[PDB]
Design an enzyme around this catalytic site. Sequence first.
Site, PDB file in Angstrom:
ATOM      1  N   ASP A 135      26.525 -28.099 -44.990  1.00 41.62           N
ATOM      2  CA  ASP A 135      27.810 -28.672 -44.595  1.00 41.62           C
ATOM      3  C   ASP A 135      28.887 -27.584 -44.598  1.00 41.62           C
ATOM      4  O   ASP A 135      30.007 -27.784 -45.084  1.00 41.62           O
ATOM      5  CB  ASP A 135      28.191 -29.849 -45.498  1.00 41.62           C
ATOM      6  CG  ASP A 135      29.393 -30.658 -44.963  1.00 41.62           C
ATOM      7  OD1 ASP A 135      29.782 -30.529 -43.770  1.00 41.62           O
ATOM      8  OD2 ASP A 135      29.979 -31.418 -45.768  1.00 41.62           O
ATOM      9  N   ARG A 139      36.808 -26.989 -43.520  1.00 43.71           N
ATOM     10  CA  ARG A 139      37.268 -27.868 -44.598  1.00 43.71           C
ATOM     11  C   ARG A 139      36.566 -27.580 -45.933  1.00 43.71           C
ATOM     12  O   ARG A 139      37.059 -28.014 -46.983  1.00 43.71           O
ATOM     13  CB  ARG A 139      37.063 -29.345 -44.216  1.00 43.71           C
ATOM     14  CG  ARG A 139      35.582 -29.684 -44.042  1.00 43.71           C
ATOM     15  CD  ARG A 139      35.367 -31.151 -43.585  1.00 43.71           C
ATOM     16  NE  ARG A 139      33.937 -31.320 -43.306  1.00 43.71           N
ATOM     17  CZ  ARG A 139      33.358 -31.079 -42.126  1.00 43.71           C
ATOM     18  NH1 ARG A 139      34.081 -30.727 -41.074  1.00 43.71           N
ATOM     19  NH2 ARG A 139      32.043 -31.238 -41.985  1.00 43.71           N
ATOM     20  N   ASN A 140      35.401 -26.913 -45.921  1.00 45.36           N
ATOM     21  CA  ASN A 140      34.629 -26.679 -47.139  1.00 45.36           C
ATOM     22  C   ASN A 140      34.703 -25.222 -47.570  1.00 45.36           C
ATOM     23  O   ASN A 140      33.806 -24.722 -48.261  1.00 45.36           O
ATOM     24  CB  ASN A 140      33.161 -27.107 -46.968  1.00 45.36           C
ATOM     25  CG  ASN A 140      33.014 -28.614 -47.004  1.00 45.36           C
ATOM     26  OD1 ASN A 140      33.802 -29.297 -47.664  1.00 45.36           O
ATOM     27  ND2 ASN A 140      32.059 -29.148 -46.252  1.00 45.36           N
ATOM     28  N   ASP A 153      30.998 -27.003 -52.012  1.00 47.64           N
ATOM     29  CA  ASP A 153      30.334 -28.241 -51.566  1.00 47.64           C
ATOM     30  C   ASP A 153      28.946 -27.995 -50.976  1.00 47.64           C
ATOM     31  O   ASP A 153      28.515 -28.695 -50.057  1.00 47.64           O
ATOM     32  CB  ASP A 153      31.196 -29.021 -50.580  1.00 47.64           C
ATOM     33  CG  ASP A 153      32.217 -29.895 -51.290  1.00 47.64           C
ATOM     34  OD1 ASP A 153      32.003 -30.179 -52.495  1.00 47.64           O
ATOM     35  OD2 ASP A 153      33.223 -30.272 -50.656  1.00 47.64           O
TER      36      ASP A 153
HETATM   37  C1  LIG Z   1      40.342 -29.401 -45.987  1.00 51.94           C
HETATM   38  C2  LIG Z   1      40.835 -30.700 -46.691  1.00 51.94           C
HETATM   39  C3  LIG Z   1      40.498 -30.665 -48.207  1.00 51.94           C
HETATM   40  O1  LIG Z   1      39.350 -30.371 -48.578  1.00 51.94           O
HETATM   41  N1  LIG Z   1      41.508 -31.030 -49.044  1.00 51.94           N
HETATM   42  C4  LIG Z   1      41.212 -31.049 -50.383  1.00 51.94           C
HETATM   43  C5  LIG Z   1      41.429 -29.920 -51.212  1.00 51.94           C
HETATM   44  C6  LIG Z   1      41.059 -29.977 -52.575  1.00 51.94           C
HETATM   45  C7  LIG Z   1      41.272 -28.898 -53.433  1.00 51.94           C
HETATM   46  C8  LIG Z   1      42.487 -28.329 -53.455  1.00 51.94           C
HETATM   47  N2  LIG Z   1      42.479 -27.325 -54.398  1.00 51.94           N
HETATM   48  C9  LIG Z   1      41.257 -27.287 -54.929  1.00 51.94           C
HETATM   49  N3  LIG Z   1      40.827 -26.466 -55.918  1.00 51.94           N
HETATM   50  C10 LIG Z   1      39.541 -26.544 -56.355  1.00 51.94           C
HETATM   51  N4  LIG Z   1      38.714 -27.508 -55.804  1.00 51.94           N
HETATM   52  C11 LIG Z   1      39.150 -28.342 -54.823  1.00 51.94           C
HETATM   53  N5  LIG Z   1      38.256 -29.253 -54.318  1.00 51.94           N
HETATM   54  C12 LIG Z   1      36.939 -29.327 -54.780  1.00 51.94           C
HETATM   55  C13 LIG Z   1      35.838 -29.164 -53.893  1.00 51.94           C
HETATM   56  C14 LIG Z   1      34.493 -29.244 -54.374  1.00 51.94           C
HETATM   57  C15 LIG Z   1      34.279 -29.470 -55.711  1.00 51.94           C
HETATM   58  C16 LIG Z   1      35.318 -29.627 -56.569  1.00 51.94           C
HETATM   59  C17 LIG Z   1      34.769 -29.818 -57.796  1.00 51.94           C
HETATM   60  N6  LIG Z   1      33.429 -29.798 -57.713  1.00 51.94           N
HETATM   61  N7  LIG Z   1      33.133 -29.592 -56.428  1.00 51.94           N
HETATM   62  C18 LIG Z   1      31.785 -29.455 -55.840  1.00 51.94           C
HETATM   63  C19 LIG Z   1      31.275 -28.126 -56.046  1.00 51.94           C
HETATM   64  C20 LIG Z   1      31.858 -27.263 -56.988  1.00 51.94           C
HETATM   65  C21 LIG Z   1      31.335 -25.957 -57.173  1.00 51.94           C
HETATM   66  C22 LIG Z   1      30.233 -25.536 -56.428  1.00 51.94           C
HETATM   67  C23 LIG Z   1      29.646 -26.396 -55.481  1.00 51.94           C
HETATM   68  C24 LIG Z   1      30.174 -27.680 -55.314  1.00 51.94           C
HETATM   69  C25 LIG Z   1      36.618 -29.565 -56.146  1.00 51.94           C
HETATM   70  C26 LIG Z   1      40.457 -28.265 -54.367  1.00 51.94           C
HETATM   71  C27 LIG Z   1      40.554 -31.172 -53.081  1.00 51.94           C
HETATM   72  C28 LIG Z   1      40.335 -32.322 -52.278  1.00 51.94           C
HETATM   73  C29 LIG Z   1      40.687 -32.246 -50.923  1.00 51.94           C
HETATM   74  O2  LIG Z   1      40.547 -33.344 -50.075  1.00 51.94           O
HETATM   75  C30 LIG Z   1      39.260 -33.981 -50.065  1.00 51.94           C
HETATM   76  C31 LIG Z   1      39.155 -34.902 -48.817  1.00 51.94           C
HETATM   77  O3  LIG Z   1      39.771 -34.258 -47.697  1.00 51.94           O
END
Ligand SMILES: *CCC(=O)Nc1cc(-c2c[nH]c3ncnc(Nc4ccc5c(cnn5Cc5ccccc5)c4)c23)ccc1OCCO
Length: 264
Positions: A135, A139-140, A153
């Site tokens: 994926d 966005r990721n 992700d």
């Molecule tokens: C592009 C739109 C988007 O994704 N918006 C968005 C941003 C965040 C966000 C902002 N600042 C951040 N700092 C750290 N993490 C995140 N998000 C995040 C993503 C994946 C994660 C997280 C915790 N655990 N995982 C899975 C993972 C971790 C490590 C290795 C592999 C996998 C935290 C973040 C957050 C949410 C957002 O919107 C979501 C829907 O659009």
Amino acid sequence: QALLRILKETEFKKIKVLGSGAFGTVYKGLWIPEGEKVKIPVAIKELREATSANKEILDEAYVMASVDNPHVCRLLGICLTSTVQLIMQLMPFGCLLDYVREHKDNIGSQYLLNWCVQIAKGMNYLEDRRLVHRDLAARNVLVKTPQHVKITDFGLKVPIKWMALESILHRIYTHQSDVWSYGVTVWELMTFGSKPYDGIPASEISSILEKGERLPQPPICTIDVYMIMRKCWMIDADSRPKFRELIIEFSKMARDPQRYLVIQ
Ligand SMILES: *CCC(=O)Nc1cc(-c2c[nH]c3ncnc(Nc4ccc5c(cnn5Cc5ccccc5)c4)c23)ccc1OCCO
């Protein structure tokens, strides 16, 4: 191993919402490790509760905690309750897709090409670890600082518009199908976050690819850059570039960015 913290509920606090979707919700918060004197800004992703495995979950999370690369996010801790909560360092500038959309008038060629290098470095590392992302998209990719991005992700609404044809037709996912998604991700960056195949129904995409049509050349891209993106979208998976090659090619372009992207 000792790479993954099992967090107690008292060791972390959700403070603000960062974003949400069908997967669940991500919060900005604080990690307050017991017996330490520190409060660490973190992101906490709380997955939706599953009706249906604790040993299996910790096994996958152990992998996410074992990655060690500046361009791949690393899982710092997990908390298993009725839900799975995943904790990692806060990436304060958010996802790269929204970052490029918000800052498009102020993003130049060196930034764009550096991001391409860094994303390719992270994917090559995942490939070296025999991990297929499945994926990859703008966005990721998360933005720690404007010139330090990391892929997230992996290891976790099918993303048809980023998928290699063999993934759409046969559910085959490989490092070379990740290269296809990398091509699409580069296209997102070079269009300052445009939507690929905008307005086209997901179920129409395979017929577009089958006919030989591809995402169009972004205005700023010279033919040298667009050709790399097109090679990522060859039907023959083994004829696509390898991530190692992509690092070398984008690193060379980053050394003379205005030769390769034309930005007003
Ligand atoms: C592009 C739109 C988007 O994704 N918006 C968005 C941003 C965040 C966000 C902002 N600042 C951040 N700092 C750290 N993490 C995140 N998000 C995040 C993503 C994946 C994660 C997280 C915790 N655990 N995982 C899975 C993972 C971790 C490590 C290795 C592999 C996998 C935290 C973040 C957050 C949410 C957002 O919107 C979501 C829907 O659009």
